[model samples]
Target: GDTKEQRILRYVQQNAKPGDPQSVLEAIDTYCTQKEWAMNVGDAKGQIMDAVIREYSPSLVLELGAYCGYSAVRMARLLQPGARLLTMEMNPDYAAITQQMLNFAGLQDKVTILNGASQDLIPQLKKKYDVDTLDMVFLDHWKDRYLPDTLLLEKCGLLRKGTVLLADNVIVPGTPDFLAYVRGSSSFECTHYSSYLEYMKVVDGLEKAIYQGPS
Candidate 1:
């Protein structure tokens, strides 16, 4: 009688004190590492992502992939009050679970969980938010979709000057095309951090790229 998502919900209900974002995050991390492997941006890389949020203090953030809402909760807690993080997860199940997790973390007000393909959702954000630029974006879904979605963001003018894009899992199950483009293009100033995959010592890392506007 224990589905993976429900297991997490139950664990958090028992282990994580409600309205405490860090406790919720730690509870999920424990569940993922000790119980089952989740696709969340785990503790190690999560800290790296957190640092970026603290540095930018972005008003509007967009996450191309939200799996189980771990990263969403992580970033939402750091965002300044009145700031917003819109995250897209294609899988309905994952989106539903993410919504629950976010609620558990008391981050529901800080984040928007959009359930749909990024290609369809990213463009809608440009219209829905009535904004032409995004301050930050996190890419962590399908590795293959990385470049295409980034291109879509660019084509739609959602990515503007000084936009920060932090992509996870760049080394393990890597996104070669995305790496090549961000590293090679004159449009972005990119940096790669060598780290390990979540809960594993295997080598992995994330790519932090900043859009410099059109060259």
Candidate 2:
């Protein structure tokens, strides 16, 4: 089937340097910025993501969405030794593309792809994936799922003190429910970063929320 995911996979396969994470990112950025638009966390937001990853220096990261593996590649490139990322994609096909993209980026070893619904995957993270507690969680999945999955993450005891929760499209595509809860909850301390949407002029941003652990 002809899809944006397929096109993105093809473009990266053709343009990106195999095993070079940065080149793969540049290739995706070029395609999304020049040829078409895809929700990748973009280069600008990506820099923000980079800084947070460096700041947190997470050993085990959880990304709620792995659309085409764009953000996966972005985050995986910065992981320290023994530090890795686990990203979940709901759709099987997109997950397949993401796997290809990760393999293409040579990050297949650095990042793990969990192909299933976030609801299904989140609960099993502890036993199935051996996640004690995520040092950082990147929420870029369904805007609506953002809140519930976050609630689930907490309920399942996947988050702990200093757990970094970075959410994208919190302003433009807007996850007000999620934002409201995080910003208002005593359990979280959130910092909002103003930015534009991926490959667009629309005002959007990321919300970096620090979990304070059941306060």
- The prediction achieving the highest lDDT against the true structure is 2
Q: Candidate 2: minimum summed lDDT over ten consecutive residues — where? A: 194-203
Which 10-residue window of candidate 1 scores lowest in summed lDDT? 123-132
lDDT of 1: 0.90
In order, the Cα lDDT scores of the candidates are 0.90, 0.92
**Evaluated with TM-score, which candidate comes out highest?**
2
Q: For candidate 2, write residues 1-215 as lDDT tens digits.
A: 69998998999999989999999999998999899899889988898999999898999999998889989999999999789999999889989999999999998999999889999989998898888999999999999999999999999999999999999999978999999999899999999998889888888899999999986
Off by over 4 Å in 1: none
TM-score of each: 0.96, 0.98
Error of 1 at 129 (Å): 3.0
Model 1 over residues 1-215: C-alpha lDDT tens digits?
Answer: 66787787778879998899999989988998899876778899989988889999999999978878888999999999899999999989889989998998899999989899999987777678677689999999999999999999999988888999999999989999999999999999999978779878788899999999998
